[PDB]
Write a protein that binds this DNA or RNA. Structure first.
Ligand SMILES: [Zn+2]
Ligand SMILES: [Zn+2]
Ligand SMILES: [Zn+2]
Ligand SMILES: [Zn+2]
Ligand SMILES: [Zn+2]
Ligand SMILES: [Zn+2]
Lengths: 140, 142
RNA sequence: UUAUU
């Protein structure tokens, strides 16, 4: 059940090893957790009213990619282009919904995008998109 | 599988619903999260040197069971008698290492402790203990 | 494809 943990937790909290100068995954940057705020991801959520807490498609124009700060903060309804575009790649709408074009290795992981590839490697690894009620209503 | 989620997470964080009287899993207290501080457990951890962050056997005498406070907090090397004895029961050393004496119901859950039961129901549900390097030494000598 | 541009 790795999908749940990535959707809920990927890059949402700071790496405790990094603050102790002990994270081996800073360069190149491959950690599960954020090291700087400009690498922080907001958990993507579908609210009870059927809307996403933020869009899977429209990028915020005020988000400061260098500092990880948006004037509207986390309540911003638009997508933030954080490091590695992880708000989009790990969004309920898109995470693991397409097939990865890259080969799969013997442990079932991506040969090119590393352990955190957000494309699917095999049927067990594919999920159906979750849609905003507004996308569903457009699809009609 | 579900073992890792219990080991790492069970009753380690405060329930955001309970603080608002919106948790429906209080009495019968089936919530995965703590509601009162004395229900909170610290995640047990095997350090790189092979020792546990805190013992699964020797109980802290400073831990106030009424308030859930120990002066050493997460760094106390001794076991806290949290409500339901959850630090011991969900410890790496003991969680699901033995068979529950109680029976399972028709959903696959313990009849006395429900789905959260810390003993294994069926040999398929067993895990091997994780041992402190010290216990490994004493055990080998037998 | 949400990392095939
Ligand atoms: Zn790290
Ligand atoms: Zn924004
Ligand atoms: Zn891939
Ligand atoms: Zn609760
Ligand atoms: Zn203590
Ligand atoms: Zn039981």
């Amino acid at each position: 059940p790795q999908h749940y943990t990535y959707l809920k937790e990927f890059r949402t909290e700071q790496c405790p090893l990094f603050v102790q100068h002990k994270c081996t995954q800073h360069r190149p940057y491959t950690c599960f957790h954020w090291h700087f705020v400009n690498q922080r991801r907001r958990r993507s959520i579908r609210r009870r009213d059927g809307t996403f807490n933020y869009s899977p498609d429209v990028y915020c124009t005020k988000y400061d990619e260098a500092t990880g700060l948006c004037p509207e903060g986390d309540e911003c309804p638009f997508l933030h282009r954080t490091t590695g575009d992880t708000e989009r790649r790990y969004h309920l709408r898109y995470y693991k919904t397409g097939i990865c074009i890259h080969e799969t290795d013997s442990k079932g992981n991506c040969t090119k995008n590393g352990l955190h590839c957000a494309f699917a490697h095999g049927p067990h690894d594919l999920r159906s998109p979750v849609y905003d009620i507004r996308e569903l209503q457009a699809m009609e």
